[PDB]
Amino acid sequence: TQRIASHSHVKGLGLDESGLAKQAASGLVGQENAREACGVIVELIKSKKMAGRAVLLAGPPGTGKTALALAIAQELGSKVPFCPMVGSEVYSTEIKKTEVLMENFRRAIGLRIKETKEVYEGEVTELTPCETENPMGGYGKTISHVIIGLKTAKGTKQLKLDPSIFESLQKERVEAGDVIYIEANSGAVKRQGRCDTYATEFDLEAEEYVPLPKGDVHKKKEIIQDVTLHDLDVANARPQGGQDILSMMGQLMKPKKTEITDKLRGEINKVVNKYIDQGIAELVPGVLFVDEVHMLDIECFTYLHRALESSIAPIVIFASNRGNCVIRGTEDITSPHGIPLDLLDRVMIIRTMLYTPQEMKQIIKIRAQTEGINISEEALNHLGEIGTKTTLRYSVQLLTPANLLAKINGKDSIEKEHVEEISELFYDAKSSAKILADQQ
Amino acid sequence: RIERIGAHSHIRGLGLDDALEPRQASQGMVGQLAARRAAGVVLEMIREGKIAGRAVLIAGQPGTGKTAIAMGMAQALGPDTPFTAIAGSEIFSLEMSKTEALTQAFRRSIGVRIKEETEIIEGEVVEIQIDRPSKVGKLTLKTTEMETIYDLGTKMIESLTKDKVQAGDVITIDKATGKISKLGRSFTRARDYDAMGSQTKFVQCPDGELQKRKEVVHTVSLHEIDVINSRTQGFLALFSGDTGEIKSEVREQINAKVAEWREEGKAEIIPGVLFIDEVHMLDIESFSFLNRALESDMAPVLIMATNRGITRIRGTSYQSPHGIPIDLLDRLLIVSTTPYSEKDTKQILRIRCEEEDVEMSEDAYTVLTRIGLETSLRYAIQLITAASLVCRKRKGTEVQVDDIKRVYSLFLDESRSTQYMKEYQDA
């Protein structure tokens, strides 16, 4: 279990097979038009065909922009990357604004890579070479194979390797009675330690007296690892390793870290294309969600032209809040949603509506249901009535403190008295604004 | 393999003839004849390459194919000539100055190519033998025409052992450096397969002479030489743009060395293109730098694009056309793109839905052209795919008028959005 947050109740866009909404499917109520619209863009994501497509969720605050923006994330499931960022995260000390944008852009493109690996392990009981006829003149002792016997908790089996493994085995310095690891395709021998059946009884040694392996001597499995392109980029930019004194940039943390196209494109898109066209990996192009996009700079908005016009881009959901508003970083240029007209020409706009009282009663009920509150129909109606006067979010937020008053007062559910009490302990924005307007 | 269709995937280059005559809708580009012909002229001068630092500004309305023309030039120019595309706002770094960023953008679009003949041994390993002692051994190699045998020195034995190569591998030896590179398994490289091992990675073995002489080209951008000479770390060239290159005896020193290589013929200089999109984002300091960066003999041609006309320049309160000072504007040839005719709009939509692999009815084309002529072309391009998804959700075969009308109702176009913004949200 985990703590309840603002959007813990939304579990999907709530769409039936024709792509409509009944009235309140999967934790969202109302907004049928907007939920249908981003129902289309969910399938735009699932088809994996388009790049850099962008949609702007535009409406008043509290009209579910964030809610259905991440209901999209619920519809897509955890398989595809859904990368959230707020419009204020772009301003950074270490790295240029547009570089944050590029990092986030290909942080939203996933790559899930499937690879079987197959392994042999066990306590090694036999280690005998196999002599053969002299390949050339009479030196004797021509080793053609080497027999190695491995024991696990399942059974004991003997195995023939070619002599190169005899050399590697000796160079790994394994002994009879310890536990090894052999990787069939690659050919490695790794000593994972003397077998615990030869127990540490008075040995204090730190080298692992490793328990006898469970399961078969031979075991294979398809490892399935999903990485974002940004993970590959970062791992190539500042790599690990105990050598190459540059790798001892280890006291230092990592400023200056704007990644380079030569690497980004020239060295890292080729390997992804290779793995994809080889049958090793699948691209999972995801979503980049930018809420409060109005906080971006004019330089950022203009960079998004180029970024959204790329073939190697996710689809981008923007959410905005402001009216016709001054673009940040400009000298008094006013434009809709605080976003330059130039970028608005590039986004399909989804309009979110302001709720009716009925819809607000439904949302209040769902939020009470989610936070674990029991609420009487009278208290629910009163929350609805005081929530028609002020914002939905305040109406919803009164639930938990009112429930605490109920619990203190010994009640099992919110009686109307408690919502009345809380609505006088705490104010909303509008009431407080009136107080401030009265007193100086 | 997976580089999804973006906004510009459909244009495979400028649809020009052998006489720089633009076709109406050939090679993915539609209409826009005059500006496309101008782009062809400057593309041919890019290819000829004998003039440095010439500058072109593609001006025009928002949406009238400026970026389409630029990427058409990029696609028609092809690889092996540097085309560096940059947004004007990319040069505002925290790690380096505006002018270092612009120098690096310029230099990243000049290539230096060193072309060298070298002799290799290419063959299928028939045997390798090697003794511990000053270890010593022999190697026998085959090509479809012949075989031969080599005695191996200690360093060669070491490098062969470092790759674990064996019979049946098909390999190259660079006679000058001795690095082995197994291209794969010859059909005689099959293991005994009495137990598990390496997979069946088979490939054909080589033909002709066992030892042969062939050409290798080492191409690096001027920024790339510059970076890797800057300081001994140098993997900077991949790490990040962490720079601030010292002008002192790196610009002049690289220029003199590359000019000497050009003159004595060791290297060929391949000047490319720097495309600055949304160049109006540059600072008056940036334009001031461009003035004299253009006036150089290691300067590529740079192309620029801008949507805006009479408006103040960034970093000051000076009005000017295109938002560029008439100082830099005097170094340029200006190519202005025109708005689209109804038939050009219809034909762009036709090509664009062909790229997106969606069928539409002619009435759907009619209404969508009407939409993209009343509102804006980009919106009509965005309705293609949305209507396609609406269509496929009803299991339709092709996009019909009702699909486009529905999805038009479903998404807004910044005109209807501003009209609906009559609610005073957070002004």
Partner: peptide, 13 residues
């Protein structure tokens, strides 16, 4: 001393 020899050979391929 020890003259340990490694062969790898294209046998009947």
């Amino acid at each position: 001393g020890p003259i340990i020899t490694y062969h790898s050979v294209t046998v009947p391929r």
